[PDB]
RNA sequence: CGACUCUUAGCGGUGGAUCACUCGGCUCGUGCGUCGAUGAAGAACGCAGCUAGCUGCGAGAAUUAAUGUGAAUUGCAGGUUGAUCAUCGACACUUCGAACGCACUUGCGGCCCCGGGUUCCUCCCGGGGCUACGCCUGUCUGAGCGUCGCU
RNA sequence: CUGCUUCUGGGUCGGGGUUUCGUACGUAGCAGAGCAGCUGCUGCGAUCUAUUGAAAGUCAGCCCUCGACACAAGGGUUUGU
RNA sequence: CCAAGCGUUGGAUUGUUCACCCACUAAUAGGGAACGUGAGCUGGGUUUAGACCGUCGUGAGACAGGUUAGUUUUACCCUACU
RNA sequence: UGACUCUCUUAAGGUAGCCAAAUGCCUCGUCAUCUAAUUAGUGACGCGCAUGAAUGGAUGAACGAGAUUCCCACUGUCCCUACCUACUAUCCAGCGAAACCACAGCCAAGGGAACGGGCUUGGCGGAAUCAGCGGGGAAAGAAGACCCUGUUGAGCUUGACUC
RNA sequence: CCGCCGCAGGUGCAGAUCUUGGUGGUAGUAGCAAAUAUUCAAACGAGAACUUUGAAGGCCGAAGUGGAGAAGGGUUCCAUGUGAACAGCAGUUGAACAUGGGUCAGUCGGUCCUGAGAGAUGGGCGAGCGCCGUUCCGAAGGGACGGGCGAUGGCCUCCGUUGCCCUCAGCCGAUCGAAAGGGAGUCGGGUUCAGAUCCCCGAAUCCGGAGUGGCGGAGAUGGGCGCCGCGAGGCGUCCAGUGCGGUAACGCGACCGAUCCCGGAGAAGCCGGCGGGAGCCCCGGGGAGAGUUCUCUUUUCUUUGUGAAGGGCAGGGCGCCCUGGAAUGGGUUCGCCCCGAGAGAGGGGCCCGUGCCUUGGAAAGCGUCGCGGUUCCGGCGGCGUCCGGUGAGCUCUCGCUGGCCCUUGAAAAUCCGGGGGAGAGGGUGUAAAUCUCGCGCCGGGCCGUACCCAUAUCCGCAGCAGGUCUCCAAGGUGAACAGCCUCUGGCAUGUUGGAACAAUGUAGGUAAGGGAAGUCGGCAAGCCGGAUCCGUAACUUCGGGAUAAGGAUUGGCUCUAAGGGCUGGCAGCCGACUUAGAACUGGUGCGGACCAGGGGAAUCCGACUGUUUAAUUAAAACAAAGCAUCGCGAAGGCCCGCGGCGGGUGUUG
RNA sequence: UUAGGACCCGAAAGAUGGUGAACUAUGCCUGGGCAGGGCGAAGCCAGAGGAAACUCUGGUGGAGGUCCGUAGCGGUCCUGAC
RNA sequence: AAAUACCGGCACGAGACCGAUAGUCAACAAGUACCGUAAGGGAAAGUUGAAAAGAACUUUGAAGAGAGAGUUCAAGAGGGCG
C-alpha cells in the first residue's frame, strides 16, 4: 500500500490540482497531474446540443500547436457549424432568394394596367 | 512561510547576522563597557515583529 | 542537661541604603538664524583582517582627495616623498522616500545611443542617456456652421 | 506486635492437609448430524464417552512440615547512680 | 410536685418555616445555640442580566402579582477538635 | 336566580370563544378525579382584583437537549451501607510556589462601640510536632453591586426645559 | 568636612489598599496525578529510572501519535563539540549553547488575467488637508494599410530603414485585485550530514526568434496539336495549375490571403442512479528469501515492475451519417426514454483512450545468490522480475442520464475555427508567391524553494489537555470512514521517580430483600438497545403517529433447496456470493466483547427546520412561511451624505 | 482670605483628533468539504375487479429545510471535573 | 527696514539648581530592550585599582568550586569588584 503526497505546494483538491495514480519504472505508485478535459467546439447556429465532429476536444491554448487539418473539417463553415444546419442554411439562403425574384416579377404587373 | 517576498527575505537575513554574540577581543579594549550582547533575540522568546 | 526559641554583641552571608565622586541633566543669557526635483527630513539595506550593538559611512563604503598637524593607530595580528588626528572647499554619495517611465510583485514597458552576437542587419545579452504631474514664457503642429477676409 | 544457633533457629523450595473451580493435554472408540473422495478402507467434522471427583490455583495475612537447599556465630549509633 | 437520664417516628401535597392529612406509636412536647450550621452541602424560594402574561404607564419602564431559564469560589496558616 | 323592567351613563359597553390557565387578589376557591393521605397534575364550575378576538381569540396532527403530572418497567435515590479497582492524598529522592499576615493565637462570665485572642475576675497553662479537620479567627477575595446621600454621572423615554 | 554670624529652601515621615527597590513568616509547605506501560543486558562516560543500541511487552490502529503542504514561524534545518544557565527530577540529552555548513528551475509557484472590489485623470465639491465619482459634463487613438520628392546600410540595385503629409481605425476606459479561480509547457532513475519535477545521467517538451531567410517536402510539373525518326522520344508553340479522395458523416503530412464580420473554447450549480477505466483489496497457482516444525501444515510472511511524449490497439461514447421504410407497433433502461421530424436491422464515420502493447526499455530499478575494491566504485557477475481468476468491494477519475430551484450556479486574459475576397504570386520555368508538413538552429532573465505544520518549531506571557485550512488512507469483525484488534510507519504514556495501599477525594464498578419510601424534582445511575420474523392503538393537516406498544428466534457444526455466466428446453466448462429449510449439539449459552432508542396516558407554550445572550439564561424568546394594511408611476417613495448635474434600493418599475 | 494644578492622592464623565472587522456580526467574491442505514413522494410496467370518470394489488423509482447516526458544526444536563 | 518675538535648529557662556528612586523618558549599545494587529506605550541599568599588577606555579574535584602561593598600601578592593 502506497499512501502518497502531492509534488506541488497546492495542498487543496482544487480544479487545477486534480491527479491520477501512476506506477513508475522504480516500482512505486505516484501522482501525475492530469490536464483538464478540453471539450470539442460547438456550432455557430447554436441550436444543436451535440458538439462538432472531426475537431479535437482539447484545451483552447493547445490549438496553437495543432495543424490546420486537426482544427477544421473540409467544408464551407467546416469546424465552426454543424453539417445538418449548414444544409438548412444553404436551402434557406436559396429558397428565400428565389422568393425575392417572385416579388421582382409580381412588381412587374400591378403598375402596367393604370 | 516557505512562500516569501524578496523584501521580507532580506529583512530576516539582517536579523540573523545581528543574532551573533560579541567577539572575545572587544572587552579587552580600553573603553570597556560591553560584557555580552544584550540585543540577542530567540525564536521562542521574541517573535521578531511581523 | 541539650534540642527548639527569644534577646544582645562579634564575625560571616543576603541586599544595595548611606556617603564621596559625575564626559548627564535642567534653568537662564548670548551670537547665529542655514533644508528640498542640483533629490530633503525619514526609512531600508549594506560596508572593518578578526565587529553583534553603538557611532562613522555608501560598491571609492569606520571612508578618497585637499589643506593644516608632524609620529602613531592599539584589543590583537600584519606592513618623513608624512604616520595619525582635526579641518573639509575637490570628488563620490546603493535602495525606498515630495519620489519622477507604469506598478509595488522589485514586477513590466518604450525611444535614441553604444558594446558583445558582429563587421549594420535584425532577434538576443549587457551598459548608457531620456521617459512623473501642475504650471510659466517662447516654439511647433493643429482645431472651430468664433470673427471676418480675398477669389 | 514479633522473630534472629536446645545441633538448634526461622526462611526458601518441595511434600501432605485444606478449600476453590468442575473433568486438562494426549490417546482410544463401528459413539457422532453428515458429506467428500476410492473400491468395505479412508478424509473433514461441532460434539459425546473412557482415561478423569480429572487438570489448574492454594498464603502472599490458611494448616502440618522434620524432605531438600543454603543461611544465622555479625554491623551501626548511643547510654552511668 | 421532684424531674431533661432517655425517647419524641414513616409519609402525601407545598421551596416553604407554617400548616394539613394518612399511618404507626410509650409519646408522636415546646424551644435555644449570629431567627445553630453555604471555605458542610443543596439551590426549590427569593433577589442581576433573557423571556411570557395580567393590571398600570403616552412612553422608557414598574408590581411582598403569577411564570420559565439562570457560574454557590479558596484552607497549605493559627487555634479548636480528631 | 335572573330573561324582562326604571334611570344615570360614555366613543360603545366584552359579542364569539376561553379560564383559579405562563392570565384569579381573596386562595390551599368549590365539585369531581388520580392517593392510604395530594397547597401538585387533571376535568369541570364562572360577577373573570385585572380573560377575550392579527395589542390576535379558540383549537391542533407532526415536532422539541422547552415547563408540569401520573403509570409500567428499571435501578444503592433511599431503608443502609459495605467491598473492589485506577489515579491521588500519604512516606521518601530531586524540585519547589502563592494567597494571607498590627501583634498574635485556650476558655467562661463581666463590662465595653450593646457578640473579646488580649482588659477585669475566675478557669488554668508543659517543648518540637505529623496526617486530618472544617467550630472559630464576626478567615480570604473585591474602597456593597442592595439602600440612602452628592446640588456626581451615564444608557433610555416623553405631555420636562432650551435648542 | 565642619563651628559661629547672616541668607535661602524641592528642609525632618510609621501610616496615605502611598511610590520604587529588597527581604520575611507561610514552607522545604501546596505541588511536579488528564489521554494503558514499561522491563532486561550492553556501550560511551567522572556520573544512568530517563541517553544510544539489541532483545522483550505495549500504545496510535489508515477521520492515526503515519507521510506531506497552505497560513504563521525565521534558521528552529543538518553536523561537530561542551553540558554554566534554560528545557518546573535528571541528562553523556534537546527545538538550549557555541563553532560551522545548508534552500540550485523555460516546465513547480510568483509574475499574467480579471472577480467582489480598490483607485487616479477630466469633472464636481471643498475654508482646507483633500474629498466625491470611475465613464459620468472630456479634443480620452500616437496604431496600421496606402502614395512621391529626400535620405542612410547594401554594386542607393531595391528593399529593409526614415521623415513630411495625404487615404485607415468603436468597445466606454489609467491602474491595482487570487501562492485554493483563468493560465502553453517535465517526467523517470541516481545522488546529500541537511537540497531536489531544481543537482547529475538519460529521455522529452512549451513558447519566442532570426538581416540578404539553413535542409527536404507540399504549392508543381497536367493539356492539345506542328516536324524528326524503328517507337519511347526529342523539340518548337496556344493553354491550365493558390492540393487531393469519400454518396455522405468526414478524411489526407502541409494545402495562399488583410481591415471587417461571426462563432467556439476559456466558461460553469448541488444532488441521484448507472456504466467503463485504473489504483487498491481479494483469489488459485508458479519463483525467490525468511518464519514454524515438540506433533500437524504441497504451509505462513515479504517481494514479484515499467515514466513523459509519439504510434497501434482494445475499450467507452455519439443528439453524426448512408441505402431503408416500421401497427400485430417496435427498440431499450436499474430508471429512463427513442421513433415518418425516419424505429429496429445492416455498412460506416467521428471524439475520447488516464487501459493494453511497442519506441523509451533493461543499459535503470527491485528481489536475490555470489565475487572482488584492505578504503580509490552509480564495483562486476549468475538467476528471477511469472500465469490466471476477479467484484452492487473501496477510493479517485472519465462518461451516460435524470431529479430540485420565486436558487439558474463568474468574468477577463488568452487561444482557435469560420465567413468575406481587398490583394499577392510566377508565365512554363534553375518556376514563383506561399505553408498550421517533417527535420535543423538559437534562446528562456527575475523572485520564492531548508525545515515544523502541531499534545514540543504557529497563536493563547510557557514544550499551555485550548485553538488553527487541506491531500493520501491496509487486513479482520461489521450496515459502516462506528468501536475494538493487527500490518507498514511512528512512539516512550505525555513537566519527575521509588516504596507504601489510611482517611477524604476524582473516575470506574458490584450489591441480599424492598423498590422512588430519597428528593424541590427519578437529579445521577439503570433499564431498553442490533437484525430477522410477527404485531402495531388513540388521534390526524391522511403525510403520519411508528423502531407505537407488545411478542418470538439468534450459538456452533453439518447438510439440503433456491438464486448465474460461458463455448457450438441441450450438453461441456469457470463460478462468486447470499436467502431459506431441516438435522445434530453445549450446564438455556448465543446482537455473548464492541456497536448500540427506556416505554405509555395527559397538560401548557411554540406549528415545524432554523437561530439566539463567545465566558452563568438555547428558552415559551428571535426568525419563519402564511396573512394583512401602509407609502410610492421616477423632478418618485424609502434612505445616505459636510458637500455637489452627488450616493444606496437600481444591471430596479 | 483668595484666583491659579494650589497641601498631596482619587472619580462616573465630557471634548478633540486618530487606530483597528487577524476575534466576532453581516453582505459579497472565490475555493474546499459532509460514513453507513430507516421511512419510500411524483412518474413508470404488469396484474386483479367492474359499466366509464374509475376502484383495489405487486414491483419499480428515489423525492424530502425527511428520520437513526459518523466526520464536521454546536454546547443540553450532571448545576460532574477544575 | 529699525526697535520686537523665539520651550525648534547651529555654536557657545553661566548657575545660591539636580546629584543616579534626584535631574530630561534617556549620565550607560535610549526613544534602546520589550509590549500591542495598529495608533501608540516604553523601561531597568554609573563606580575594581595609582597602574591589570585581572590571582603564575603546586595540589583536591568530572568540573563548578576550594586550600597554598603571588600582585597591591589594601583582594578586610577578585571581572556588575569604592
UniProtKB/Swiss-Prot annotation, chain A:
Q: Where is this cross-link: Glycyl lysine isopeptide (Lys-Gly) (interchain with G-Cter in SUMO2)?
A: 107
Q: Which GO terms describe its biological process?
A: translation
PROSITE patterns tied to this protein = RIBOSOMAL_L34E (PS01145)
Instruction: Give the transmembrane region(s).
Output: none
UniProt keyword terms in alphabetical order? Acetylation, Cytoplasm, Endoplasmic reticulum, Isopeptide bond, Phosphoprotein, Ribonucleoprotein, Ribosomal protein, Ubl conjugation
| Main location group | cytoplasm
UniProt entry tagged with the keyword Secreted: no
Residues with the modification N6-acetyllysine, per the entry, are 35, 42
Q: Does the keyword Transport apply?
A: no
Q: Which GO terms describe its molecular function?
A: structural constituent of ribosome
Q: Which GO terms describe its cellular component?
A: cytosol; endoplasmic reticulum; ribonucleoprotein complex; ribosome
Which residues are annotated as modified residue Phosphoserine in the UniProt record? 11
> Where is the protein found, in the record's own terms?
Cytoplasm, Cytosol; Cytoplasm; Endoplasmic reticulum
Q: Which domain of life is it from?
A: Eukaryota
| Function text | Component of the large ribosomal subunit. The ribosome is a large ribonucleoprotein complex responsible for the synthesis of proteins in the cell.
Quaternary structure per UniProt? Component of the large ribosomal subunit.
Family per record: Belongs to the eukaryotic ribosomal protein eL34 family.
Q: What is this protein called?
A: Large ribosomal subunit protein eL34
Q: Which gene encodes it?
A: RPL34
